Design an enzyme around this catalytic site. Sequence first.
Site, short mmCIF file in Angstrom:
data_model
loop_
_atom_site.label_atom_id
_atom_site.label_comp_id
_atom_site.label_asym_id
_atom_site.label_seq_id
_atom_site.Cartn_x
_atom_site.Cartn_y
_atom_site.Cartn_z
N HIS A 108 1.02 -1.42 -0.17
CA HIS A 108 -0.10 0.55 0.13
C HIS A 108 0.76 1.30 0.12
CE1 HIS A 108 -4.39 -2.11 1.34
NE2 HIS A 108 -3.43 -3.14 1.52
N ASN A 147 -9.78 -2.78 3.50
CA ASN A 147 -9.57 -2.76 1.80
C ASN A 147 -11.06 -2.40 1.29
OD1 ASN A 147 -6.69 -3.57 2.15
ND2 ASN A 147 -6.95 -6.00 1.91
C1 HDD Z 1 1.41 -10.33 7.78
C2 HDD Z 1 1.59 -9.62 7.58
C3 HDD Z 1 0.27 -8.87 6.96
C4 HDD Z 1 -1.62 -9.13 6.27
C5 HDD Z 1 -1.76 -10.57 6.55
C6 HDD Z 1 -1.01 -7.91 6.20
N1 HDD Z 1 -1.34 -6.70 5.83
FE1 HDD Z 1 -1.87 -4.89 5.70
N2 HDD Z 1 -0.31 -4.19 5.98
C7 HDD Z 1 1.07 -4.61 6.72
C8 HDD Z 1 1.43 -6.11 6.61
C9 HDD Z 1 0.35 -7.03 6.21
C10 HDD Z 1 2.42 -3.84 6.85
C11 HDD Z 1 3.57 -4.74 6.51
O1 HDD Z 1 2.62 -3.33 8.02
C12 HDD Z 1 1.94 -2.74 6.42
C13 HDD Z 1 2.36 -1.70 5.30
C14 HDD Z 1 2.87 -0.49 6.10
C15 HDD Z 1 2.16 -0.60 7.28
O2 HDD Z 1 1.74 0.60 8.15
O3 HDD Z 1 1.88 -1.76 7.64
C16 HDD Z 1 0.22 -3.13 5.89
C17 HDD Z 1 -0.34 -1.91 5.12
C18 HDD Z 1 -1.82 -2.05 4.90
C19 HDD Z 1 -2.69 -0.99 4.76
C20 HDD Z 1 -2.05 0.49 4.45
C21 HDD Z 1 -2.08 1.66 5.29
C22 HDD Z 1 -1.70 3.06 4.82
O4 HDD Z 1 -2.70 3.51 4.01
O5 HDD Z 1 -0.61 3.26 5.48
C23 HDD Z 1 -3.78 -1.37 4.24
C24 HDD Z 1 -5.30 -0.53 4.29
C25 HDD Z 1 -3.26 -2.70 5.19
N3 HDD Z 1 -2.27 -3.42 4.84
C26 HDD Z 1 -4.89 -3.63 4.76
C27 HDD Z 1 -4.82 -5.32 5.07
C28 HDD Z 1 -5.63 -5.97 4.97
C29 HDD Z 1 -7.83 -5.71 4.74
C30 HDD Z 1 -5.32 -6.97 5.55
C31 HDD Z 1 -6.05 -8.16 5.82
C32 HDD Z 1 -7.65 -8.60 5.36
C33 HDD Z 1 -4.53 -6.63 5.50
N4 HDD Z 1 -3.88 -5.72 5.07
C34 HDD Z 1 -2.82 -8.00 5.29
#
Ligand code: HDD
Lengths: 678, 678, 359
Positions: free
Chosen positions: B62, B135
């Site tokens: 993202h 999402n």
């Molecule tokens: C195990 C790791 C992992 C899993 C299973 C998911 N994510 Fe996540 N997501 C991340 C690890 C992550 C991250 C690496 O921790 C991020 C990147 C930047 C941040 O702050 O978190 C992230 C970012 C991120 C953002 C951007 C937030 C923003 O605008 O800064 C959204 C909207 C989501 N995620 C949504 C989801 C949804 C709806 C998931 C499943 C239902 C999901 N993610 C599963």
Amino acid sequence: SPLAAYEVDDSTGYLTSDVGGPIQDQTSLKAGIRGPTLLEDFMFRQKIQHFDHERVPERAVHARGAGAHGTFTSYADWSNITAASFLNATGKQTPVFVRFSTVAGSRGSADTARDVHGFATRFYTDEGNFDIVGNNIPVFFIQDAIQFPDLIHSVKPRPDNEIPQAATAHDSAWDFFSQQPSTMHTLFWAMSGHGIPRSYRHMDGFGVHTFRFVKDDGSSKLIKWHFKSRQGKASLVWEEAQVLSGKNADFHRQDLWDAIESGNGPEWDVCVQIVDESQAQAFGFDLLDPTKIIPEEYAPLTKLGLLKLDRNPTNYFAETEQVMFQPGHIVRGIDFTEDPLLQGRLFSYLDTQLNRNGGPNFEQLPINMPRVPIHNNNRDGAGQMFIHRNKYPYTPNTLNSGYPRQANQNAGRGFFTAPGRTASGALVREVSPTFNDHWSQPRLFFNSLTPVEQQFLVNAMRFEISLVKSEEVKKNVLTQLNRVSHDVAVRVAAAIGLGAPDADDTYYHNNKTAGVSIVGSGPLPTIKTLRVGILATTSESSALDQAAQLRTRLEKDGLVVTVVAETLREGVDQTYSTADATGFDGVVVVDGAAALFASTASSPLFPTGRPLQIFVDAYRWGKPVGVCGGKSSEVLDAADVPEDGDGVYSEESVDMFVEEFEKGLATFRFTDRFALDS
Amino acid sequence: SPLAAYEVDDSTGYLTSDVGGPIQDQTSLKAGIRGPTLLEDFMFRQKIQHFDHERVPERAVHARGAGAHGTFTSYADWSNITAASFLNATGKQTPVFVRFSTVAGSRGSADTARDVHGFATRFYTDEGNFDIVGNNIPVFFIQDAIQFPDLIHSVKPRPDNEIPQAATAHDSAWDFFSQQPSTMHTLFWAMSGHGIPRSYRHMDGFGVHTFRFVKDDGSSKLIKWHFKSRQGKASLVWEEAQVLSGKNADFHRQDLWDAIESGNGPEWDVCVQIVDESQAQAFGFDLLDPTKIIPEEYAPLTKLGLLKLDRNPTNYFAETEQVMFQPGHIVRGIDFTEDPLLQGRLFSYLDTQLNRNGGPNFEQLPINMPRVPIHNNNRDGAGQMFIHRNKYPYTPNTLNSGYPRQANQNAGRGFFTAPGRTASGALVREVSPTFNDHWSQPRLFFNSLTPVEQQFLVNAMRFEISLVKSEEVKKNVLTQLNRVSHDVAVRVAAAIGLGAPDADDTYYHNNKTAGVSIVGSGPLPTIKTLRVGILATTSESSALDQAAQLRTRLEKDGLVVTVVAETLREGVDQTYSTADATGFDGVVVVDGAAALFASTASSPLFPTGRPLQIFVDAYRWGKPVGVCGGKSSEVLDAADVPEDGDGVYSEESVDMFVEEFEKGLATFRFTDRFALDS
Amino acid sequence: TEQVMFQPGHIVRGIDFTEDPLLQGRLFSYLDTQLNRNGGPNFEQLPINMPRVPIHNNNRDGAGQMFIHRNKYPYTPNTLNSGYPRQANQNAGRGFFTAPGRTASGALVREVSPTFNDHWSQPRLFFNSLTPVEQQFLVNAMRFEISLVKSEEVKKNVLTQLNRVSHDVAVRVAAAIGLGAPDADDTYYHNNKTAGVSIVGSGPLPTIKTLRVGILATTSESSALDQAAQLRTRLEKDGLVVTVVAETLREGVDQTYSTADATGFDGVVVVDGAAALFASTASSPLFPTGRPLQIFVDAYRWGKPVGVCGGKSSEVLDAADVPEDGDGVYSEESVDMFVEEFEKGLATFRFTDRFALDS
Ligand code: HDD
Ligand code: HDD
Ligand SMILES: [Ca+2]
Ligand SMILES: [Ca+2]
Ligand SMILES: [Ca+2]
């Protein structure tokens, strides 16, 4: 290949942690089969932690780019002009790595943005790494490094909303250009076809600054670096570049990758212009000024050797993303000048690698290591990979017998500052009056383009300036363009419904210089790697037969051929659905396929009119197009393409078709298809 | 603004250093006027060091996104289902910040890539910051957090050459999809119109996971979060999305920006499905499984309140780039479930902010701060902005009188785990068998689309899978598609010249569910902010007259009107050179401009055929198009558009023209212009 | 040393964790804290942290990435890298596996097990298991530290807790800080003991190799340096580290009186040729007044073996107020007999009869 010692093979074996313990990584450890995940799941956390920390800051500029490995070979013993060891014998080979880039866009931005392009070359010499960090345009926007954040903030997205990406087409950029008239020379180059090259392989590289070549006796000469492409110079047209940005953001990195994989690795002659110290101001400008070129009429190129890129990286992140270039990576026999843009660059590139790498030991990354022993007293720091044996890392010492020893002009082949260099006068924050002519050389450049090239540049400015909202900025832009050329200011003003200011002829002249025009530099010297789209159909078995026969004939001459049909099968590379004119340097329809081009065409397998749109786009964008089969007139009528047009081919004979079509590919663009101002 | 206290004004005053010393920053300090730059130039170094360090790592996913400030308003006292304080009173207002995004692209990639989109909302409540990190698609690709790096590695560019950008159309992604069948549900959503939304305002948001509402008495219920767009749902067509990606990489961020500035701030109803704990496995699947929806026929939406975005950020970097969301930012009244995807996310988001921020005090950034006091014994760390007075930061203490006090279910309104939660069984790394049906719900989704929507989904898959080079991967993809729908597999297979495998009807059914269709959700409820391009000419004063009259009547209904002509002047917003059909939701030609549409039309001011191409493109992409003034036949004939077509308008009267045209904009897309597989 | 990054998460097949709540949280901390130290996620690639076997995983990128990974399909499950790396578990690839008998049951709780609640019995078991002098030292460490606590209330609260372990401890500690101990509370008092926790009681050291012997000599007397050289050869033969001390360096002399201290030795010997340095009117610009005698006296007071070698012992021992018949005090003319007795003293290590006991 210090790169091959660090290579890690995962073609066999069981998954391990980073400390070699075999593990699994597909299911979390839970308290019961529908239970919560446990904190003691070290397999989970080591894997996610690594993922969570995979990114590193993008470069502050030139973030979007791609690289390749190759070789530099000297053509001679250049002892007579430089002590540089990589230039000291005929045939001497040095490994290189090159990264090409845009300037303004972030990672992920499109390759075919309009921009200045980076051309950065590392020579892993036997006396240390030497970097020439150049651009595809020989002059820079500004005359002092302290202004670099001003230039960059102005061209990058507006910082409230971060719009627009990878584009100078917004108020802030043109405000800066119009208030800082040094920008005019680079602006004119960026608004020409040099802003939208066909490929990294079809552009030149330049060091921009004057540097010094220093002999072992200590005498020096002033040089400019020129990497002259052996593939020829070539550009996109803007309306084509825009669509390419969407259809294939990776176009330049893909082109480079593919050329290397096919055995067509690109080549440049590495050249210098060499002039005496006494000529620093002899040419009607100051060689310390990075907004000025030395016309080749005043100083010819000398060819030093051949640069060839012939191998792709193994891991993009580890090699291309992590390569950390510096103009400070200099070797004995090369020296700086007092160019105030160069001077500040020396500071920036050492400092910025701390941001990218997160620690001071960035020169220990495999891509950054030299190919010679390191002996110094640098110690510790985050991420220290060496185990230093010398437990007395200070000079002067007796307890390590005085090692490492000082190197200098007379010991250990040390780097030394050119001994004739001097300075005199007050300590000032003042611009040299010798830098004040901002408009003559833009005009020289403009005068040196062909009429259609001049129109393309005017059109680029009309495009960008029409998107500036401020009426004051637009007026100020015309004021500055008018000082280069009244004609340019008039034709640009016409598009934005303002009046140009009255001619002011102080810097007007009619002089030209050789070798800056793309369209004028004759047909391409080779057509290998150029892309031909053959538009066919699964309707007629004759169409795929004619496509196959054309394919053989074109592939013979090293062209990359793509047969396009409604659906994939044997002999067909691409569907109409995924095909676009931006994908090809030339398009051929096989007459077997003529029904697809009618206006009532329609298929659930591709968008309405796609077959004809490919052909029409290719024609309008100046590409060689044709129909092969001997019933050509039907497709050419549907396209409104005249059979007698230059770069339009119609033959029944495959062999005669190909022979003429290949001459079209060398011509590359048919510029008679573009309307010119009256 | 909440963040007004941190704003810095530079509208007056002299340049200073960061420590308030007045300085200059335009010329380096040199030893003489053509001399070398000095190391003592602190003005130079502080400015360039800051520049050199401006960039921070992009988000690991993202990365490409945009944000705005707003308000949430509760519709009721929701005490009876949750203790959550922001939901405890009719009309209660809480500030929010929302960021929208794609998943796969780097931070300069195009907004209109095909992808899953993020919708992340921070509620700055009076009991702490609460984040819902959602999402635009209600189901996720994988069933265990530990698999996230596998998913993301496979969808991101191939790691040797970093190709291709922001796209699933390559071998690794479809390899992963075909070997990991859990992916099928999200895959079908992403291949539908939901993968290419018309704007962030025209998509919904979903929490995806089942969560818990917890009352003050400790009883809980299972919830899913739904943010339902008040602007309606709308998508692009793929061929449009591709050109838009080039013509305007910033399309979605610009659309959101513009809607807020024009006082058309987007709204969502924030809703929940609420079910009892006993229904975790009552609906024929496991509520802990994030690849499953609860069909609305089994549990209706309850509207909790209104989310309105109405204020753009001041500085993108400081607000949008630095906002650090966490599902760990939970408040009293909400709890987690044992969803193995959710469970692992709780680790990832706390960890990854260390990468982004480069230190542990990221909650002190203005955008991350809460709007209530902080009382804890967290200390020190890089970048510590607080000066803590309590010199006994340990519990238990007597020397700070036992403060801060522990908060829990019975004291200080503490967070508490839902007390009915239990765990039982072996500590296992095993997948629940209740998660094993990967194919029924993809089929439910497919069955709930209209025929043309089904075609578009098939066509997205034909497009992507035709670009997969491995024949083995393509075969494996058809195997999985076939388990969802034999018809899908047959239709996809036809484009890639493989046969589909024989039908396997284990998971085939004919069930449908409401509200997942875009095309099927009736006309848009509002046409405010939709874009109308009026194609005019400067060559006829009557054309600009017609355009001005059209503008008045369309602007009255809150449409954004662009008049396009050859050149700018009063009344004219854009030139043909910069205009494109991707810039409009509907296109009108004023009949005074008919001469520009002839096949011999040519001008140095715009690319050949540009006026007609805009009209043709808009028609082909399903947009309402028309000719205003009475003489419609040459334009429609040149375009090959039938006068009697749905969404084709031809009226003499501006009044009548607009009344009909506006019905067309609400209809949004005319689906009868797309061919269906028989 | 500085870069070694340990983790209890570095576990191998054949070992597993327990539900000790202290251990459970440690597993998180040590992975997280190395990001702070190393400034990036590739800390396992530093030479000290690398394994001595191949690494096969899909971890990629990150600042400081030293590897060039050939596998361009780093995801599972895959076919484009033939399903490699393979998953390891109990039954394939010698994988780590969680002990399969482990289970969990009951509510999700932030509550302490009642089984953890006896904080005082084992502290008492430990104290009971020390020798009388060891018990005194422990009391004295508490009297030292608690006497520096300014808060009267904290001091009272301390005696409340100590008293639950041992009324005697609380009494003896209380006496130093001018509070009264609270009345005995005998819930956790017992008389049980356990083997092997005592230092004093674990007998003589099993080896005296590496222990440090200071020989205090003089350059006044060629006799003194001859005695020192003879002592040195005999002590070095048994692997002791010998330092000869004198006013100034020269051959055979390791350290000046200026740099020497009793803290630098496990045993101190004066050669009798050096007796004049030990008088009260001894004084030199080359060392602080009284330094030679102070080394000897400090060594004696701190329980070390001390002696005089050469036959004439009474002037040194009287100057130092050290009784000639004391345990761990040696007087012999013969170097061989001196060293045989003195080495017994080094193995005893500390003569605990020189420390006063309460009551
Ligand atoms: C195990 C790791 C992992 C899993 C299973 C998911 N994510 Fe996540 N997501 C991340 C690890 C992550 C991250 C690496 O921790 C991020 C990147 C930047 C941040 O702050 O978190 C992230 C970012 C991120 C953002 C951007 C937030 C923003 O605008 O800064 C959204 C909207 C989501 N995620 C949504 C989801 C949804 C709806 C998931 C499943 C239902 C999901 N993610 C599963
Ligand atoms: C005072 C600052 C400053 C100035 C005046 C310049 N640059 Fe620079 N340039 C940087 C500061 C910098 C930088 C911030 O230090 C970068 C970003 C990342 C890095 O390694 O250095 C950079 C990167 C960078 C790259 C990318 C190297 C790569 O592929 O990794 C190229 C090709 C150039 N520059 C070329 C130039 C040319 C030809 C210049 C003028 C003649 C120029 N830069 C002026
Ligand atoms: Ca701007
Ligand atoms: Ca750091
Ligand atoms: Ca791939």
